[PDB]
Amino acid sequence: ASKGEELFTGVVPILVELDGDVNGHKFSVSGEGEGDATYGKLTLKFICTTGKLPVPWPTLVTTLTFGVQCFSRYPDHMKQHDFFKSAMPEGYVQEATISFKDDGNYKTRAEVKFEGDTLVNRIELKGIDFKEDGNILGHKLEYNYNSHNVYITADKQKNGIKANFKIRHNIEDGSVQLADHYQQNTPIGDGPVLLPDNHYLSTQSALSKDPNEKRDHMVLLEFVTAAGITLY
């Protein structure tokens, strides 16, 4: 267990700021909400502040929530495996490559750290090689998000962690759009961090709309629980 974990015993306010460019379609997203790691619970509202989002909202969920993996519920018996909180408050840098099968890719860079008592995530996203009337730029994905695992492994070399997982977005015709994810996280601070044994994050997400919101937006309720390492 770590000193960073003490920062997460109660409800913590969250800010997310994203600048994106996908095939030259530029956009920004701002998110606000809060996290309660005791319950692995996230409540966030994201708004496209530049007009219409040029990609489907579900394709941004992992990018927008990458940095809030510090709100995962680690069972007590697994708390020595929680890198994310151990890096706080100084934070970490995160990079990911998200490869959409038979389409383009996102590359992201982000920094997550505390700013006072708020957990702040700042993200840059670059997407290239998308098909103009593919499932992403053609907006052919359902507004939903399947439950999934995020497989974590240590990168001791680099004093950090990696994650690998596949997302299966639902296409409106009943098919699936696969998105391969590779994530790397590195501490910003010089203090010690927890380098975990292999384990995963079990994630469940519900996407909705604010009925009074006329801007392009996404309301997200997400639960994230660590598992995979195991008295009666």
**Residues in contact with Mg ion by the rule CB under 5 A:** 174
Query: Minimal distance in Å, beta carbon 101 to Mg ion?
Result: 18
State the minimum distance, in angstroms, from the CB of residue 98 to Mg ion: 22
In terms of CB distance, is 40 or 56 closer to Mg ion? 56
| Helix (H) / strand (E) containing 82 | none
Three-class SS state of 75? coil
Beta bridge partners of 128: 105
φ, ψ at 173 (rounded to 5°): -80, 5
Q: Distance between CA 101 and CA 178 in Å, rounded?
A: 5
Rounded to the nearest whole angstrom, what is the least distance from the CB of residue 202 to Mg ion in the complex?
Answer: 23
Partners of 187 in beta bridges: 92
Residue of 67, 62, 42 lying closest to 188 (CA atoms): 67
Angle at 115 between CA 75 and CA 196, to 5 degrees: 30
- Residue 175 Cβ vs Mg ion, minimum distance, rounded to whole Å: 9
Other C-beta atoms within 10 Å of 25: how many? 15
> Cβ closer to Mg ion: 174 or 211?
174
Nearest-approach distance from CB 142 to Mg ion, in angstroms: 6
Shorter beta-carbon distance to Mg ion: residue 116 or 174: 174
Smaller CB distance to Mg ion: residue 172 or 197? Answer: 172
How far is Cα 130 from Cα 107, in angstroms, rounded to an integer?
13
Residue 171, phi-psi category: left (phi > 0), alpha (psi -120 to 50), beta (remainder): beta
116 contacts: CB under 8 Å, gap ≥ 6 = none
Q: Which is closer to Mg ion, CB of 76 or CB of 173?
A: 173
Nearer CB in complex with Mg ion: 24/174: 174
DSSP 201: E
Least Å from the CB of residue 122 to Mg ion: 34
CB of 67 to Mg ion, least distance (A): 29
